[PDB]
């Protein structure tokens, strides 16, 4: 039951590595999951709902990893603090490139996908701003831009930059350079005047 659901989700993530959702049939999903078409429709209303669930899983994995880090202060300098945090997203989304690529595309055509991404971006921005504010309150960061506005632009930079790198877009930062690139921009913009 739960196991036929997991098989459908696994089949979908596998087929998205090779082609876009548009080119994947419900037949392809049911065949890969070893069920019939009408059995598929018991578990999901459409191939679009499958992608929504895959993206929901990946986004919550990143969020839950960030929560784990927020509980356990890693014993490091300000640069390493931000690098470990950005790295949650680099590794989580980087480990699910096909779901990442298809989910970002679906935002255009799915209000549920757009709303999921929006909800988590607001959470990540809020957390970023809360850390910047703590750094200002302890005297480690200068009171420059409004923290929420700075957090918003930095999170949008990471969204666009990591997705471009993982998709191999032209232009993009090479994947093996993107973490250093983003950490430099975060640290200089948070701590600089």
Ligand X SMILES: CC1CCN(C(=O)Nc2ccc(O)cc2)CC1
Note the residues at the interface with ligand X (CB under 6 A).
85-86, 89, 124, 127-128, 131, 155, 158-159, 162
HSE at residue 174, side-chain half, CA atoms within 13 A, is 2
By a kind-dependent CB cut-off of 5 to 8 A, residue 85 interacts, out of ligand X, a second copy, none, with ligand X
Question: Residue 130, interface with a second copy (CB under 8 A)?
Answer: no
Q: CA-based Rg of the chain, rounded to a whole angstrom? A: 19
The residue number with the shortest CB distance to ligand X is: 85
Contact 127, 66 (CB under 8 A): yes
Q: DSSP code of 20?
A: -
Q: Does 23 bind a second copy (CB under 8 A)?
A: no
Q: Which residue has the tokens 């899983």?
A: 57
Peptide bond preceding 86 in cis form (omega within 30 of 0):
no
Integer Cα distance of 176 and 150 in angstroms: 25
For residue 155, state whether it binds a second copy (rule: CB under 8 A): yes
- Token pair listed for 127: 């957390």
Q: 49 contacts which partner out of a second copy, ligand X, none, CB within 5 to 8 A by kind?
A: none
Taking the least distance from each CB to a second copy, the nearer of 27 and 180 is: 180
- Residues lying near a second copy in the complex (CB under 8 A) are found at 105, 108, 118, 121-122, 125, 144-146, 149-150, 152-157, 159-161, 164, 169-174, 177-178, 180-182, 184-185, 188-189, 191-193
């Amino acid at each position: 039951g739960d196991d036929r659901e997991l098989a459908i989700l696994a089949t979908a993530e596998n087929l998205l590595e090779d082609r876009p959702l548009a080119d994947i049939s419900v037949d392809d999903l049911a065949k890969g999951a070893g069920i019939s078409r009408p059995t598929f429709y018991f578990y999901f209303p459409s191939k679009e709902a499958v992608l929504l669930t895959l993206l929901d899983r990946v986004v919550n994995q990143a969020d839950m990893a960030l929560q784990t880090l927020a509980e356990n202060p890693a014993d490091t300098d300000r640069e390493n603090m931000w690098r470990t945090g950005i790295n949650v997203f680099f590794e989580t989304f980087g480990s699910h490139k096909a779901v990442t690529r298809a989910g970002q595309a679906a935002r255009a055509t799915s209000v549920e996908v757009a709303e999921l991404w929006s909800t988590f971006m607001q959470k990540w921005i809020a957390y970023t701003a809360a850390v910047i504010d703590a750094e200002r309150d302890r005297g480690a960061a200068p009171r420059t831009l409004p923290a929420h506005e700075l957090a918003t632009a930095l999170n949008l930079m990471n969204e666009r930059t990591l997705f471009a790198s993982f998709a191999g877009e032209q232009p993009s930062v090479p994947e093996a350079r993107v973490l250093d690139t983003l950490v430099h921009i975060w640290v200089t913009s948070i701590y600089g005047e």
